[PDB]
DNA sequence: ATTATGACGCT
DNA sequence: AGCGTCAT
């Protein structure tokens, strides 16, 4: 009843760029704009691996992870842009720098948590309170929400999508009580107005379009964001949760896309998020552990407490290359050359990071994979990172891994290496 | 023969 | 610490 918390204390948004790497390439090369196009890395093997796909191309069934030669079978006129190559490896600098552009604009509106290269969570709670004071009990015009969907509406008593969007919006605004400044539905609505403004600013100043979700926590904001893409934003109210979750596959919720989600389905014999409400907190804890059990118990009711962490910069800077099939490194000279290439890119990124962000990494992590292992990493060892120098870093990396060489021969490397990975971590202010 | 990342949890 | 999971 009156003591039962409802997880409506915050307004949280998740902003995610539409087909991000593609938009970066389309801004640079107008010939790619408004075309079925994809971004690919490498080229020799099957025309390269697709990593981002424009919405026009998705209509043909082109997807991420598809080989470009295969995508071309679905979409003969597919245009491609290739990821830059430096020191023999894909170099993602252009996209990282474009990411910074967006993150800096968002940070003008509120504190953000960088969640990936192309998305950030936003805690809008305080910004909403402020805007509410400005409004002075003034109603919110639908004009202020020109790209917003209200999940679950319209309902009750309509052919085209934009018209549906507006009907839903009008039902929502018609029911709002703007008299109450602590009304969670009102707070979300004002949050959506701010997110419209943030999204407009992003597009004006970068050229990039994005989608967004607005709700009361990160998981719902994230789910909302994906409900209407591209170039639209979705508000998921506390009230919409029971209907939304009643047919929502468990795997769609962030963190349940893998083995745990699979275990939830298997052990409990259920399919949808809403079916979780029927179990006690202790029951869920017994199957999935104290922490997961509590989290699932609240989450299936639309409640989640993870804070938007104030962190705009990545916590690690890493460089990685796979050496698949026949290209696996089988000589010490090979291993040393590629560690150097990786270390050189890393030094470059580290030096720029130190200048821009006044911090220095203190730990170097070195990871490899050996031919045969089905695991991402076979071995992960750390050493001290005392100087931003590529030759030293690569020499150190070699030293920590050199014992993995089964070969009785000094020159040879066995079993061959199918992945190398250098990662700088444990930053300190400088 | 996706690849190149990046965060966080467990013990 | 080194490993595993989940994600973009
Ligand atoms: N598995 C991956 N491997 C390599 N790069 C990836 C991978 N997943 C995502 N990326 C890169 C390319 C994407 O443009 C960018 C953002 O990813 P993501 O948000 O999942 O999709 P997207 O922005 O391309 O399309 P959407 O409009 O569906 O969000 O990160
Ligand atoms: Ca995206
Ligand atoms: Mg994303």
Q: CATH number, domain at A129?
A: 3.30.70.270
Cβ burial of A162 (10 Å; 0-12, 13-18, 19+) is: exposed
Tell me how many domains chain A contains. 4
- What angle (nearest 5°) sits at the alpha carbon of residue A320, between those of residues A211 and A419? 130
How would DSSP label each residue in A359-391? EEEEEEEEEEEETT--SS-SEEEEEE--S--HH
Q: What is the CATH number for A390?
A: 3.30.1490.100
Same domain, residue pair A101 and A173: yes
| Helix/strand/coil for A207 | coil
3-class SS at A6? coil
Q: Say which residue the tokens 């800096």 belong to.
A: A104
What is the radius of gyration, based on Cα positions, of chain A?
A: 25
Mutational pocket test of ligand 1: of A81, A118, A254, the residue with most ligand atoms within 8 Å of the beta carbon:
A118
Angle of CA points A103, A162, A18, to nearest 5°: 25
CATH number at residue A70: 3.40.1170.60
Which residue is listed with tokens 């821009």? A356
Beta bridge mates, A14: A121, A213
Among A215, A140, A141, A152, which residue's Cα sits nearest to residue A179?
A: A140
Question: Phi, psi (5° rounding) for residue A233?
Answer: -130, 150
Q: Are residues A69 and A133 in the same domain?
A: no
DSSP-derived secondary structure letter, A77:
T
Nearest CA owner, ligand 1 atom 3: A51
**Using what technique was this structure determined?**
X-ray
Residue A426 and residue A365 share a domain: yes
Cα A9 to Cα A91: distance, rounded to the nearest angstrom: 42
> Residues near A327 by Cβ (< 8 Å), separated by ≥ 6?
none
What the block records as the tokens of A325 is 């099939």
Same-domain pairing of A146 and A96: yes
Give the E-state strand segments of A151-287 in sequence order: 210-215, 233-235
Are A122 and A242 part of one and the same domain? yes
Q: Enumerate the nucleotides of strand C whose atoms come under 7 Å of any protein CB.
A: 1-8
Residues with CB under 6 A from ligand 1: A 16-21, 51-52, 117-118, 229-230
Q: Do A56 and A125 belong to one domain?
A: no
Q: Could you identify the residue written with the tokens 């029927």? A: A278
* A220 and A234 Cβ atoms separated by less than 8 Å: no
**Residue A379 and residue A239 share a domain:** no
Domain boundary among A73, A88, A103: A88
| Domain housing A53 | 19-88
Q: Please tell me whether residues A137 and A62 are part of one structural domain.
A: no
Do A97 and A50 lie in one domain? The reply is: no
Q: Which residues 6+ apart lie within 8 Å of A312 measured at CB?
A: A103, A107, A112, A113, A114, A120
Strand B bases within 7 angstroms of protein beta carbons? 1-10
Question: Pick from A92, A95, A114: which is nearest to A104 by CA?
Answer: A114
Q: Of A64, A88, A112, which residue is a domain's last?
A: A88
Residues A7 and A49 in one domain: no
Domain of A292: which CATH number? 1.10.150.20
Q: In terms of domains, do A74 and A185 share one?
A: no
Mutate to test the pocket of ligand 1, among A14, A37, A52 (most ligand atoms within 8 A of CB): A52
- Degrees to nearest 5, angle at CA A181 with A178 and A187: 80
Task: Using the CB atoms, write b or e for A400-420: b if 16+ within 10 Å.
Answer: bbeebbeeeeeeebebbbbbb
> Residue A363's Cα: distance from chain center in Å?
25
CA triplet A250, A259, A70: central angle to 5 degrees?
85
- Among residues A245, A211, A210, the alpha carbon closest in space to that of A225 is found at A211
Total length of chain A: 430
Resolution in A: 1.9
Is residue A373 annotated as involved in ligand binding?
no
DSSP string, A9-60: S--EEEEEETTHHHHHHHHH-GGGTTS-EEEEE-STTTT-EEEEE-HHHHTT
Residue A213 shares a structural domain with residue A69: no
The residue among A88, A112, A133 that closes a domain is A88
């Amino acid at each position: 009843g009156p003591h039962m918390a409802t997880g409506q204390d915050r307004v949280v948004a998740l902003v995610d760029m539409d087909c991000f790497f593609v938009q970066v390439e389309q801004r640079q090369n107008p010939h790619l704009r408004n075309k079925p196009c994809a971004v690919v890395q490498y080229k020799s093997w099957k025309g390269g691996g697709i990593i981002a796909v424009s919405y026009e191309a998705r209509a043909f069934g082109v997807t991420r992870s598809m080989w470009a030669d295969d995508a071309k079978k679905l979409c003969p006129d597919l245009l491609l842009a290739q990821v830059r190559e430096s020191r023999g490896k894909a170099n993602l600098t252009k996209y990282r720098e474009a990411s910074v552009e967006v993150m800096e604009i968002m940070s003008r509106f509120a504190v953000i948590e960088r969640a990936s290269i192309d998305e950030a969570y936003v805690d809008l709670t305080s910004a909403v309170q402020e805007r509410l004071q400005k409004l002075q009990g003034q109603p919110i015009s639908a004009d202020l929400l020109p790209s917003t969907y209200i999940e679950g509406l319209p309902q009750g008593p309509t052919v085209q999508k934009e018209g549906m969007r507006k009907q839903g919006l009008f039902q929502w605004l018609d029911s709002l009580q703007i008299d109450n400044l602590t009304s969670p539905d009102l707070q979300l609505t004002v949050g959506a107005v701010i997110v419209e403004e943030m999204r407009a600013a992003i597009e004006r100043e970068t050229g990039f379009q994005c989608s967004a979700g607005i709700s009361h926590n990160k998981v719902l904001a994230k789910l909302a964001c994906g409900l209407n893409k591209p170039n639209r934003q979705t508000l998921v109210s506390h009230g919409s949760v029971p209907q939304l979750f009643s047919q929502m596959p468990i795997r769609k919720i962030r963190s349940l896309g893998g083995k745990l989600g699979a275990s939830v389905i298997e052990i409990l014999g259920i399919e949808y998020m809403g079916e979780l409400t029927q179990f006690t907190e202790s029951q869920l804890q017994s199957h999935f552990g104290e922490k997961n059990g509590s989290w699932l118990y609240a989450m299936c009711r639309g409640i989640e407490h993870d804070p938007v962490k104030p962190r705009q910069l990545p916590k690690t800077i890493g460089c990685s290359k796979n050496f698949p099939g026949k290209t696996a490194l089988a000589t010490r000279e090979q291993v040393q050359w590629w560690l150097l290439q990786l270390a050189q890119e890393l030094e470059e990124r580290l030096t720029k990071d130190r200048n821009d962000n006044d911090r220095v990494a203190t730990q170097l992590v070195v990871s490899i994979r050996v031919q045969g292992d089905k695991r991402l990493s076979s071995l992960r060892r750390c050493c001290a990172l005392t100087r931003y120098d590529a030759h030293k870093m690569s020499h150190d990396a070699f030293t920590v891994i050199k014992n993995c060489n089964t070969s009785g021969i000094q020159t040879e490397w066995s079993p061959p290496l199918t992945m190398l990975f250098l990662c700088a971590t444990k930053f300190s202010a400088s």
